[PDB]
Amino acid sequence: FKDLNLTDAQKQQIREIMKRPPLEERRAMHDIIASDTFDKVKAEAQIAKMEEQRKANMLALMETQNKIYNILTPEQKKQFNANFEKRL
Amino acid sequence: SFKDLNLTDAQKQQIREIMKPLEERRAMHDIIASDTFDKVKAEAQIAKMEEQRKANMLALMETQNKIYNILTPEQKKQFNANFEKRL
Ligand SMILES: N[C@@H](CCC(=O)O)C(=O)O
Ligand SMILES: [Cl-]
Ligand SMILES: [Cl-]
Ligand SMILES: [Zn+2]
Ligand SMILES: [Zn+2]
Ligand SMILES: [Zn+2]
Numbered sequence: 001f002k003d004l005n006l007t008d009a010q011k012q013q014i015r016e017i018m019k020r021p022p023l024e025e026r027r028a029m030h031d032i033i034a035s036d037t038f039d040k041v042k043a044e045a046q047i048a049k050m051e052e053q054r055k056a057n058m059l060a061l062m063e064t065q066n067k068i069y070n071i072l073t074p075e076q077k078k079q080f081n082a083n084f085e086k087r088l
Numbered sequence: 089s090f091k092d093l094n095l096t097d098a099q100k101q102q103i104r105e106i107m108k109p110l111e112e113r114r115a116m117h118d119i120i121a122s123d124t125f126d127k128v129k130a131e132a133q134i135a136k137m138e139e140q141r142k143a144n145m146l147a148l149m150e151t152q153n154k155i156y157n158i159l160t161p162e163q164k165k166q167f168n169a170n171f172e173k174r175l
């Protein structure tokens with residue numbers, strides 16, 4: 001949101017606050033799904049490989065949201081926190 | 089999208105047979121709403137549910153593989169084409 005009444009300074013701070021696409025990963029997933037048989041050990045290896053991209057993506061998402069939280073005023077943080085409850 | 093594939097009645101029954109949470113949000117919330125970003129704590133949060141994620145993914149991928157294999161040649165081409173166009 002869009003719920004927080006962001007000052008123009010804050011939105012510039014935010015714009016400034018905001019690796020490779022997990023594409024070869026999807027390819028390996030495709031090959032597991034399209035196979036004549038299910039290969040559990042190969043699937044486990046794909047899951048484990050996906051954990052490294054997920055870690056990167058989660059760390060980036062949490063760090064971004066943390067830096068945004070800390071440009072907010074007390075009133076805005078309260079609204080941010082309420083909104084966080086309301087998703088999903 | 090498996091339903092977009094003109095499933096036969098037999099396939100609908102086969103899929104039926106084949107097919108036979110906030111505690112983690114709260115930890116993310118604690119990491120986000122802090123006056124500093126604690127990367128060590130975040131990495132531990134991210135890793136906590138690794139084994140449940142694995143069990144869930146494995147079940148999904150196996151279910152997907154099972155459904156893919158009841159498709160006809162035509163249906164598989166449609167599914168694979170849609171897969172290429174997505175994500
Ligand atoms: N709220 C503190 C807890 C202490 C710690 O984890 O070091 C932090 O996120 O850093
Ligand atoms: Cl793909
Ligand atoms: Cl929460
Ligand atoms: Zn305001
Ligand atoms: Zn307002
Ligand atoms: Zn600037």
Ligand SMILES: [Zn+2]
Binds near residue numbers: 027028029030031
């Ligand atoms: Zn592939």
Ligand SMILES: [Zn+2]
Binds near residue numbers: 026030171
């Ligand atoms: Zn593909």
Ligand SMILES: [Zn+2]
Binds near residue numbers: 027028030031
């Ligand atoms: Zn391939």
Ligand SMILES: [Zn+2]
Binds near residue numbers: 031
């Ligand atoms: Zn292939």
Ligand SMILES: [Zn+2]
Binds near residue numbers: 030031032035036
């Ligand atoms: Zn294959």
Ligand SMILES: [Zn+2]
Binds near residue numbers: 040042
């Ligand atoms: Zn194997």
Ligand SMILES: [Zn+2]
Binds near residue numbers: 044
């Ligand atoms: Zn295993």
Ligand SMILES: [Zn+2]
């Ligand atoms: Zn195992």
Ligand SMILES: [Zn+2]
Binds near residue numbers: 048049050052053
């Ligand atoms: Zn990796």
Ligand SMILES: [Zn+2]
């Ligand atoms: Zn970085």
Ligand SMILES: [Zn+2]
Binds near residue numbers: 063
């Ligand atoms: Zn950084």
Ligand SMILES: [Zn+2]
Binds near residue numbers: 074
């Ligand atoms: Zn408020």
Ligand SMILES: [Zn+2]
Binds near residue numbers: 075
């Ligand atoms: Zn107010």
Ligand SMILES: [Zn+2]
Binds near residue numbers: 079
């Ligand atoms: Zn308000």
Ligand SMILES: [Zn+2]
Binds near residue numbers: 114115
């Ligand atoms: Zn808690």
Ligand SMILES: [Zn+2]
Binds near residue numbers: 126128129
């Ligand atoms: Zn810690």
